[PDB]
Chain A
Amino acid sequence: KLSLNRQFFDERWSKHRVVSCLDWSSQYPELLVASYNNNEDAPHEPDGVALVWNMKYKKTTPEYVFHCQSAVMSATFAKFHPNLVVGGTYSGQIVLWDNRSNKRTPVQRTPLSAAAHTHPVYCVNVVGTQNAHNLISISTDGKICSWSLDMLSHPQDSMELVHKQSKAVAVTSMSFPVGDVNNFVVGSEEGSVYTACRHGSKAGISEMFEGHQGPITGIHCHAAVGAVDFSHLFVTSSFDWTVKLWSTKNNKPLYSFEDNAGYVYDVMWSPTHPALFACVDGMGRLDLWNLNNDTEVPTASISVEGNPALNRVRWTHSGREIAVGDSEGQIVIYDVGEQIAVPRNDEWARFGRTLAEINANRADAEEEAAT
């Protein structure tokens, strides 16, 4: 079941700000980084705020406070650097915070030149191994640059993403398959979901998916790995009141989730349960969809008090407590029940049978309608 676990809110910083990104550290599963946008009511305060909360301690104050000159739109932890917080801002800078410094001002930032990002950056990620990794960032002009975590002055690999007739895909969010560095997916704001490859003979957008009728607000690949591989699976969120489930082979949406009667903002797969993901809306209702249980109603639903616009939702690496932000900075930590979170030993096979049945009924849905 859905029950409250922890409430996070800071009076001095997170007042009248909207949560913009959420992430848990891979090395420290109790640490959650929280991006914030600009508060127009307080022009003299810093525009971008990047607070870090702690789950283990019972205190209400943020553990770490960082702020930037411009508004922070996307901020993640560094995967292989435990002391760093990487953020992307409204102006296109990629700020690199640090904890051992005595300043909340970022210790490293990218230049605002044509060799780096200039339009707003809404997604950053760290992919690679311990001995070899890079920072990947895509802005809203479609430019993608590969940074190293030290050389923050100029990128190593830079390329411009085009799909047809050299038009600019306006990328809003980006996902990566697990264990994959080269191939990945993106979601434009023109409604079109694309997959892509980073480096090789073919670099850029590979395929195309039409699907949605509104801008893609969030997209995540499948995360749980078991007996049956599901690395070719991803889901999308869009402004057109639907969550659509996809795969890298079929060029059509495998399913549509029109059950919400409002806007829909994020969705991301469970890292443990292979058939579970959570989505939010504009009225604060947090929904969970277990595909092995039912493919037409949310498996569990809760709403936060006051009904604000829930912007971002993030699962922990344990898959048990999930985090969600809103328009007031009122970060709520929701712990799901173990009856929904923990999967059975045959849950991968049950999900494979569910996917086969969904594919069969969807492929059978349109031929008898046409004929």
Chain B
Amino acid sequence: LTQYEREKALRRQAEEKFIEFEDALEQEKKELQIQVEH
């Protein structure tokens, strides 16, 4: 029970770090794209 609970929690910790990294570096690559376009 506790092993499954810990494993679910550390899957969640994988699943918002993905989101934060994703939108942060997507915004940075988008600003890089528009600055190289102009």
- Closest residue on chain A to residue B6 by CB atoms: A114
Interface assignment of B24: CB less than 8 Å from any CB of chain A:
yes
Interface string of B8-38 (1 = CB under 8 A from A): 0000000001001100110000000000000
Given the complex of chains A and B, what is the CA–CA distance between A28 and B36 in angstroms? Answer: 64
What is the interface of chain B mostly: helix, strand, loop, or mixed? helix
On chain A, the residues within 8 Å of B24 by CB distance are: 165
Number of A-B pairs whose CB atoms are under 8 Å? Answer: 7
Given the complex of chains A and B, what is the CA–CA distance between A166 and B14 in angstroms? Answer: 10
Which size bracket describes the interface of B in this complex?
A: under 10
A8 CB to closest chain B CB (Å) equals: 48
Number of interface residues of A (CB under 8 A): 2
What is the interface of chain A mostly: helix, strand, loop, or mixed? loop
Interface string of A140-179 (1 = CB under 8 A from B): 0000000000000000000000000110000000000000
- Closest residue on chain B to residue A162 by CB atoms: B17
On chain B, the residues within 8 Å of A165 by CB distance are: 17, 20-21, 24-25
Given the complex of chains A and B, what is the CA–CA distance between A144 and B17 in angstroms? Answer: 21
A333 CB to closest chain B CB (Å) equals: 50
Interface residues in A165-208 (C-beta closer than 8 Å to B)? 165-166
- Closest residue on chain A to residue B13 by CB atoms: A166
Given the complex of chains A and B, what is the CA–CA distance between A127 and B20 in angstroms? Answer: 35
- Closest residue on chain B to residue A114 by CB atoms: B6
On chain A, the residues within 8 Å of B25 by CB distance are: 165
Interface string of A4-17 (1 = CB under 8 A from B): 00000000000000
A320 CB to closest chain B CB (Å) equals: 51
B16 CB to closest chain A CB (Å) equals: 9
On chain A, the residues within 8 Å of B20 by CB distance are: 165-166
Given the complex of chains A and B, what is the CA–CA distance between A166 and B12 in angstroms? Answer: 14
Given the complex of chains A and B, what is the CA–CA distance between A165 and B24 in angstroms? Answer: 9
Given the complex of chains A and B, what is the CA–CA distance between A166 and B25 in angstroms? Answer: 13
Given the complex of chains A and B, what is the CA–CA distance between A93 and B25 in angstroms? Answer: 38
Given the complex of chains A and B, what is the CA–CA distance between A165 and B28 in angstroms? Answer: 13
Given the complex of chains A and B, what is the CA–CA distance between A165 and B17 in angstroms? Answer: 7
- Closest residue on chain B to residue A166 by CB atoms: B17
Could you show 7 A-B contacts with beta carbons less than 8 Å apart? A165-B17, A165-B20, A165-B21, A165-B24, A165-B25, A166-B17, A166-B20
Which of A's residues lie within 8 Å of B, judged by CB? 165-166
7 tightest A-B contacts by CB? A165-B21, A166-B17, A165-B20, A165-B24, A165-B17, A166-B20, A165-B25
